[PDB]
Every structure is written in C-alpha cells, then in structure tokens.
UniProtKB/Swiss-Prot annotation, chain B:
Component of the 40S small ribosomal subunit. Part of the small subunit (SSU) processome, composed of more than 70 proteins and the RNA chaperone small nucleolar RNA (snoRNA) U3. It comes from Oryctolagus cuniculus. It is found in: Cytoplasm, Cytosol; Cytoplasm; Rough endoplasmic reticulum; Nucleus, Nucleolus. This is Small ribosomal subunit protein eS28. It comes from the Eukaryota. Keywords: Acetylation, Cytoplasm, Endoplasmic reticulum, Nucleus, Phosphoprotein, Ribonucleoprotein, Ribosomal protein. The modification Phosphoserine is found at S37.
From Swiss-Prot, chain D:
Residues 116-136 are annotated as: Disordered. It comes from Oryctolagus cuniculus. This is Small ribosomal subunit protein uS11. GO terms for biological process: translation. GO terms for cellular component: cytoplasm; nucleolus; small ribosomal subunit. Belongs to the universal ribosomal protein uS11 family.
Curated annotation (Swiss-Prot), chain E:
Its main location: cytoplasm. This is Small ribosomal subunit protein eS26. It is found in: Cytoplasm, Cytosol; Cytoplasm; Rough endoplasmic reticulum. It comes from Oryctolagus cuniculus (Rabbit). It comes from the Eukaryota.
From Swiss-Prot, chain F:
This is Small ribosomal subunit protein eS17. Gene3D superfamilies: Ribosomal protein S17e-like. It is found in: Cytoplasm; Nucleus, Nucleolus. InterPro entries: Ribosomal_eS17, Ribosomal_eS17_CS, Ribosomal_eS17_sf. Component of the small ribosomal subunit. The ribosome is a large ribonucleoprotein complex responsible for the synthesis of proteins in the cell. Part of the small subunit (SSU) processome, first precursor of the small eukaryotic ribosomal subunit. During the assembly of the SSU processome in the nucleolus, many ribosome biogenesis factors, an RNA chaperone and ribosomal proteins associate with the nascent pre-rRNA and work in concert to generate RNA folding, modifications, rearrangements and cleavage as well as targeted degradation of pre-ribosomal RNA by the RNA exosome.
Length: 215, 64, 25, 136, 99, 126
RNA sequence: CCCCAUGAACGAGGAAUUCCCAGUAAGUGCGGGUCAUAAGCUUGCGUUGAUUAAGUCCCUGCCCUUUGUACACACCGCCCG
RNA sequence: CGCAAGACGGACCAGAGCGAAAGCAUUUGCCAAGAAUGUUUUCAUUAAUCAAGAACGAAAGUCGGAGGUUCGAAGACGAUCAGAUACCGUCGUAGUUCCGACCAUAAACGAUGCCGACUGGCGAUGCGGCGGCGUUAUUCCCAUGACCCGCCGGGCAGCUUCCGGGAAACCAAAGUCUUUGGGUUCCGGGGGGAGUAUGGUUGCAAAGCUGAAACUUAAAGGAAUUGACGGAAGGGCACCACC
RNA sequence: AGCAGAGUGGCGCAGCGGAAGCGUGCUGGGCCCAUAACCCAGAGGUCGAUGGAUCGAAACCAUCCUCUGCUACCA
C-alpha cells in the first residue's frame, strides 16, 4: 500500500509470554487500524515470534531459540503459545568436527493432551580421557544401540507429562543430560542437545486451558 | 557528506602501495579520541606526526 | 580430442558408403 | 511519526535482514515477527552504475539513510539476521556485509545481537554451469 | 613418467567415489582429489570490532563465528594461490605449513 | 651508501690484531699509525679503512671471545675452564641410588648395596 | 660578408614519442675541431639557475631461483585440416 | 505464513571399509549372501591355470509405458571479435528420473595376468583372537564397554637403504636372470597405409566382434641432461622503464 | 500521367530548419623487428532553374523543369 503516512495509520501493541518465563515482556508489533474489509485481529494472528532463551529466563545461554504463535488477542496484548524450539547455526556447526562420529535419531510422539510433536536430537562421540590415538570413531553396532536408547528416553518423558512439563525439562535440558549418562557405559559421549522440535498437530483453542499458561 | 571537516594525525607509517608505489598506507589517530585509529591511503609524501584533513572516516582502506 | 575426431569423420564416411552401396542394390 | 508511548529506559527491537552478495545489497528493517515492515533500500538506488551495487560505500550510504527512519519511528535497537545467497551457490558473504554494520552502528543505532542465517541444503539439485563449469 | 605416486590424492582400494563441485570454477571433480579448505572467521571482522562491541545493549556478549567448508578444484586453487609449484624433492611432504 | 668491507680488509685485519695485540688502543688515529709502522699498506685510503676495522674488532674482543681469530689471554681462560670447573670435585655426589629392574640386574652380578625402591606407575604418557 | 628595398607561413600545435634527479634541467654566450674563403654540425668551457621525487614492478627490459615444453636455425620456434 | 510437485542425501566423510569388476553413504524392519579370525571337529588329494561355452558389465544411445522439479546436446536470442556457427549472459527441445526390453563399449589405468616359494628395517590404521602391571563407566561388583601397553593372523597403505634389479624414471618387487628352466593362460616384431578394404557373424537402429594388401618412408618413439622460451610461480634491479 | 526520390564537395547511399550527413574507398601518418587487426589525418566547390520569409537555404517553405523508383495512359 501507499496510503499517506502509512506508519501513522498503524497501531502499536504488546506481546506477552507465558507465566513460566521470568521476563514476560517479549516486545512490540504493529498492524493497521480496523477496516470493514479486514480487521486488526485477522491480520495479527498466525504470526511466529522468534525469541531467544537468554532474553526470557535471564540466567542462561543465548541459544535454544523458541517459536511462539499468537493464538489470541486481548485488548492491546497479544498472548502467545508454544510452537516448537530450534537451535542456532554456529553452535550446531562448531560441535561437528573431524574425527568424531555423529549420532542422530528422531521420534514422532504424542502428549497426554492433543499436542503432537516431532523431536530431533543429536549425540557426538567423546574425544576420550587420555587417548594417544587421533581418532574417536566407533563401530556401527554400538551406534545403533545409542540411537535406540536415545529414542527410549525421549518417548518416556514426553508421552507422559503434559505440554508445560515438557518445556520445563528442556529449558535446563534435563532431557539431554539424562541420555548422556544413560549411554555412558557403551561409549562415554559428550554432548546431547535437541536441535529442533516441530509442533505438527495441536488440539482446539480451549480458552480454559489457554489462560492457565498466562495465569 | 554532512559530517563537518575532521582532523586526524599520523601515529605511524606502514608502507607504500598502489601499482607504482604512488599510494601510502598509514595509521592515523583521530585527534579527539586517543584509542580510536583508522588505516588510510594518502597520496602525498608524509613523514609522521603531521595532520591531515579528512572529509569522512566512514571510508577505510584495505588494499591498493 | 584430435584422434577422437579422426575416428569420427571416418565413421560417418563408412556409414555413407554402406548407404550408397545399399542404394546401388 | 508516532512511536509507542514508552521507550525511555527500554528499547524497541527490530530485525535488520541484511542481504549479502554480489551485484546487490538489500537492507530491509522489519518487525520482531517480520510480518510487517518499514523502508527498504538497495545499493542500486544509492549508486547507479550497474557495477557498484555490491560496493562497500553503496552499502554504507544505504544503511546511513535506513537507520534515520528507524529512530524517526521509534525503533532504536536491532537484532541482526544475515543472508548469503546459498542454495548450492557461493554461500559466502559479499563485501557489503561488514560495511553496513560499521556505518549504521556509528550513525547512532544500538546493536542487540547478530547471527548467521543462510539457506544451506542437506544436498539438493544440480548447479548451473555444466560439468566443465565457467571458464573465462 | 609419473609425477605422483597416488595419482590423485587418494583412491586406494576403492573403485569409485561421488564427485563434488568447485565453488568458483563451477567445475566437477572427485571429492578425494578436491582441495579441501575449512575456514574460521568472526562475523563482524576485526577492524570494526571496537565500534560495534561498545554499542551493544548487553555488557558482555561473545560473537558468533563463520563456519564454511570450501572445495576448490585443481585450476581454481592455483589461480587464487592457496597452492603453488614446488621442487622435485619438496613434493614428498604431507605436512601443512604452520600458522 | 653501500661500502660493505671486502675480504682483503677482513683477512689482514684479523692477522694484524693477532700478532700486534698489545700495540692496539681503541682510538682511530693511534691504531692507524701502528698499522703504518708494523706493515706497509700501499695506499692511503686503504690504510684509513684497515685501521677503522681493526678499531671496530678491538671493541668486541674486550667482551667474549671472537670466533674468527685467537688471542693469548682467551686461550688462558679456555684452559682455566677446561681443567676443573668449581661445580664438583666429588663423583657425582658420591652416593646415588636406583629403582628396581636395575636392582634385578645387580642381583645377578653380585651387588647388593646402596639402593632405594619405588615402583612407579604404568605407563608411557599415561 | 655588407647596404637599401620586398614582408610569406606561423597567433602554441592530432595520432604518437624523446630526455632528464643538483650547480642537475632549461635559458645564454665563448674556445677548439674541419678551414685559401665559410657552422644552423660536433667537442669542451663559463655565466644565470627552477618545479618535482627520496618510490615501484603497472608498462618496457634485465639478473637469480623453482616449474613446464612436441623448442635447440632456440617462440621472429614448432605444427593441423 | 501455509500448501503442492519433482529431484536429492550436505557438513560429519578419512592415502577409512565392503564388492569379482562395474560400483556402494538419511531411518527402521524383513529376505537371502560373504570375508577374516577361533577350534586337540569332519572328508582324505577332492588341486592350479584355462580353447569351447556362460553370468555381470559406467555414461551415452535405441524401442514401449509412467513422470518431467533441476540441469540441459539441438535450436532462438544478447554480447565479445575484422570475422565468432565458439568461450560468456537469457530462453529452451531431446535427454536427465522410474518401470519393462535392447546395446557390450571407456585413460573399463596400479597404463603393472593368475597360483606358489624364498629374501631387510620402522612406525601406524581397519577386523578377529590372546595376555596385562594401569584408570574410568554400572548394581560395590564379577561377566562387559571406553582409554592405556604388548603379542599372533590375514587386509588397505606409508616411511627408510650400497637387499637386488632397471636405459633411467623408479620398484621389498618391476627382486632371487648369460651363474638364463617352479606351474600356466593371453599377447608383441621399424613408422605409415588402417581398425580402412573384403567376406563372415551379432544388433530394430546406432554399431560391435573377427580383420588384409598394393604402395610409401629413415625415421617414428622412451627416459634423462644442458640451454632458450612461457599471456607459469617466488625474490631483486634501471628516469636508455614507469609514477 | 497519380504517388515517391534526387538533380555531389572523392566514391556509393543522398541527412537534418547551421555551409558535405552517413557508410565506404583511395592516399598519407601512428603502433609493431615486420604484416594483419587497431588508432589518427585529408579534398579549389549557391548541391537543375524562378521566388518568398530568413542571419542564411541540397537542406525553412513555395512556384517550374528534367531524370529515375512504384503505379500506369494520354500519345
């Protein structure tokens, strides 16, 4: 559009996060003022909001970015809902290096509620305690165990435990740390992260369940 | 541009560049900030400790 | 490339002789 | 131009979407969401020569204007997202990546964060140029 | 006769490999003949680092790095001068020169 | 500029310092006149050079020993370092003990005194 | 060689190109050489006396190493339909 | 921001592994196959190499269907050039992909037949087995994995030298050769003419396999050395070079 | 004859309201050891007649003639 003063016809807003975050003031957006051919809220819902982890928790690392969608608008405050987490590029790149064997697996999983998720994890072999060898490569048999046991843990903790409790385990990354010790006997391993989660399906709006998060 | 006329002075000369040695790399101190320093290309014969008259410090040198 | 071309010009020429002899009978 | 009703001790954070490589530089300042946006300036608009569109000063002169209209509105800080072309191409920044930052920061705008974003395949379709590739 | 012993960079015990494309000749060569150069740089580059770091909204922040894996071919390596001609008794090194 | 000294200067400069070490001063003019009397240098400009290098050498010879030519007093102090050093007169400190696997050799060769035992851990770099 | 008369092109020069770093360039006169008569030439000498540089391998060329070659009448080479 | 289509398996991925060769990288399961090692098990010479004959055999191409994102012979344009049917830019058909039939060729190169014996040194790496003074992981454990050290097989490779050989380059094999003989298959005879002529055979097509002579000529070719030259690389230098 | 073009200043084509316009050729110079390619330099001058505006007219615009191009008839 090319309407005269098209940033003095826009209306400022605020964007509020769930109660689980210490700092809930995400930031600000703007949409155009209401017309009868297209209203404010219809051009404001269905967005994505990339936000860092450090930005909200204010205690910890600047990676593990979360996506948040505006599902509801309430009087100049846009309330958000979980949509899936992702990871930075540089961290994901730096860990990958020569003379290691990268280990990967995924699962499709359902929550106790109607949410459906598709988690992606990663493991890397350890450059061991006092090698004089310049390799850290592992057998193929050993790897397929580690992948099997990385699925077993990540289904147990996410099939039970409702949507919010999932998030609570991933913020300190209790999930990943649990796998690191449980695989330690068959190869020591340093590093476990969940590089993506993609919320595939989700249930109905459910206003009662909605406001619990922003309580 | 719309920046006023700046003045900055040499701290050290680095070496000559260009394709006939006609340009000279030089390090210069901003003469208002003593921890700020930019590298420049300067045409004329320079010694050290003399002052220039920069029209901008947006520009910066990297090669011949 | 040179040898591969000398083998190619003589291939098409050989093919033409076949056609020309098949034409003659 | 009307900004929000407080920005006194806080900042308002936009996303800068700097584009990189050759024959072109974009700077395109947007919302946090990126759904809606503000002014968008190219190095082909500052400089017309069809060959200085990727130059340092053309990228600097661009951001030297864009950063004014930011603060005019009320956007004071910037998260940064990069983009090199990628997609089985050069996948490496142009000249005008380093350039625009140095200019826009010292114009007065705040910098909040910076990151690399590039579209990198996990192996995808064949690249233009043929088996023997470009020569001359 | 031969000016090599490997006749490539390595093809020992293997009948075929998947090829890979040059970044700036747009050429096609084997993976195990291509010049493999990995690269590390800072994003912002070190000339303007002071002018940027002061203008951060945070009081500290370590900057990302730029990770790229480049594969060059025989011709586009020599021309950009990451390699050069070497002497007859000085081609027998496998060793990278130190920084 | 230029004017790097040739070998004809450096050959005779060394010789003239070896056999007339005593006559030398460290002044230019005195070292000139000595070279004029103990030898003949057939040019005048050549003489002014050989003196100046003889001077420049004599500065360094009053420090540590030069490796191009010899003098007597350096060969004195050479001999003084090379006939006794003050560090030891004892061999080596008279009693030194060793750890096992050396003791086992000595057991089978009729020796059984002046030993210690320590059985240090496995292994190389570990 | 001298005297009087006659009074042209030419009003700062295209494509290109030469030479020069300190009593140097440029301006200016003089001696010697050839010489029966005769320097716009050449070789030396004084007098007046700047601007610009304190560098580089871009062009032209030269020295050293390494490398490639079907060249050695030596790339102004050799050789194909 | 969402959806669809087709293609494709990055970084990790290495003088690493497997396969007769051609070749072979996302997950999980199923189906059959194989090497090495271990064994105080079984059979008792059942073997080695190979005319005839047989299976597999890149890419391109041909025939019939499906599909057709991407790249792209052909073709149409835009430039560069005296010319420019080219290198470069835009568009784009066949093809590229899958299914069923054909085609049998490549620098299908380690340009190096297969099987067996003997003859230096040294450090690694992948797999199996054996031993251990050492640490660590879990139930404190044992059984075991990870790391450390050593030993025994067979495998991809490297380094080292007056083993010996070679025209040399080089090679623990290309060695054990005028002091010539372990077994066996294939193949070569100066350079052109020519993989042409011709007849046979196979193929739908394209072609594949088999393959001469007349005539012509004193050189063709290999390795290495010294020069010169290079729109090769690294240094240095000149107002007869430049700024 | 209806329509169109022209009536050289070396050639050929004839460009527009500022006295050769374009393309080409010839001749000479430059570059290069040399040739090609490439770069420069030329040449007596109402441009068929009769008129008007005009500072001026092949060229700004008319009145006439002739030659040709296309169409085509009086004869």
């Amino acid at each position: 559009k090319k309407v005269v003063d098209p940033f003095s016809k826009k209306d400022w807003y605020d964007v509020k996060a769930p109660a689980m975050f210490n700092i809930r003031n995400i930031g600000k957006t703007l949409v155009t003022r209401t017309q009868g051919t297209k209203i404010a809220s219809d051009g404001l819902k269905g967005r994505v909001f990339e936000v860092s982890l450090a930005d909200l928790q204010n205690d910890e690392v600047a990676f593990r970015k979360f996506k948040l969608i505006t599902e509801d608008v309430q009087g100049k405050n846009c309330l958000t809902n979980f949509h899936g987490m992702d990871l930075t590029r540089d961290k994901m790149c730096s860990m990958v290096k020569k003379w290691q064997t990268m280990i990967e697996a995924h699962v499709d999983v359902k929550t106790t509620d109607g949410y459906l998720l598709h988690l992606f994890c990663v493991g890397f072999t350890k450059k061991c305690n006092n090698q004089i060898r310049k390799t850290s490569y592992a057998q193929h048999q050993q790897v397929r165990q580690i992948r099997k046991k990385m699925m077993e843990i990540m289904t147990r903790e996410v099939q039970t435990n409702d949507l919010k409790e999932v998030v609570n385990k991933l913020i300190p990354d209790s999930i990943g740390k649990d796998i690191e010790k449980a695989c330690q006997s068959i190869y020591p391993l340093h590093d476990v992260f969940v590089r993506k989660v993609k919320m595939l399906k989700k249930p109905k709006f459910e206003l009662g369940k909605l406001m619990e998060l922003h309580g | 541009r719309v920046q006023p006329i700046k003045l900055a002075r040499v701290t050290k000369v680095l070496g000559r560049t260009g394709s006939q040695g006609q340009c000279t790399q030089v390090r210069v101190e901003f003469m208002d900030d003593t921890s700020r320093s930019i590298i420049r290309n300067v045409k004329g014969p320079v010694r050290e400790g003399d002052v220039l008259t920069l029209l901008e410090s947006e520009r910066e040198a990297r090669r011949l | 490339m040179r040898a591969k071309w000398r083998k190619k010009r003589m291939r098409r020429l050989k093919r033409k002789r076949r056609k020309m002899r098949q034409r003659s009978k | 131009s009307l900004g929000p009703q407080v920005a006194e001790g806080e900042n308002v954070f936009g996303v800068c979407h700097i584009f990189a490589s050759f024959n072109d530089t974009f700077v395109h300042v947007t919302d946090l969401s990126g759904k809606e946006t503000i002014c968008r300036v190219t190095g082909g608009m500052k400089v017309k020569a069809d060959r200085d569109e990727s130059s340092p000063y053309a990228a600097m002169l661009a951001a030297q204007d864009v950063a004014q209209r930011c603060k005019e509105l009320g956007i004071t800080a910037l998260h940064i997202k990069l983009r090199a072309t990628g997609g089985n191409r050069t996948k490496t920044p142009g000249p005008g990546a380093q350039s625009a930052l140095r200019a826009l920061a010292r114009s007065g705008m705040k910098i909040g964060r910076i990151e690399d974003v590039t579209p990198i395949p996990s192996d995808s379709t064949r690249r233009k140029g043929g088996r023997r590739g470009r020569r001359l | 006769t031969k000016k090599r012993r490997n006749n490539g960079r390595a093809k020992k015990g293997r009948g075929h490999v998947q090829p890979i494309r040059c970044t700036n000749c747009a050429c096609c060569v084997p993976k195990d003949k291509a010049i493999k150069k990995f690269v590390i740089r800072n994003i912002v580059e070190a000339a303007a680092v002071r002018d940027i770091s002061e203008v951060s909204v945070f009081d500290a922040y370590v900057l990302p790095k730029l990770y790229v894996k480049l594969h060059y071919c025989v011709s586009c390596a020599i021309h950009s001068k990451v390699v050069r001609n070497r002497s007859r008794e000085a081609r027998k090194d496998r060793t990278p020169p130190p920084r | 500029m230029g004017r790097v000294r040739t070998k004809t200067v450096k050959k005779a400069a060394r010789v003239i310092i070896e056999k007339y070490y005593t006559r030398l001063g460290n002044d230019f003019h005195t070292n000139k006149r000595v070279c004029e009397e103990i030898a003949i240098i057939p040019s005048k400009k050549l003489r002014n050079k050989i003196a100046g290098y003889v001077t420049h050498l004599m500065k360094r010879i009053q420090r540590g020993p030069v490796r191009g030519i010899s003098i007597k007093l350096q060969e004195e102090e050479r001999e003084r370092r090379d006939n006794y050093v003050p560090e030891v007169s004892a061999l080596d400190q008279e009693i030194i003990e060793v750890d096992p696997d050396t003791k086992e050799m000595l057991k089978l060769l009729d020796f059984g005194s002046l030993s210690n035992l320590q059985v240090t851990q496995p292994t190389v770099g570990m």
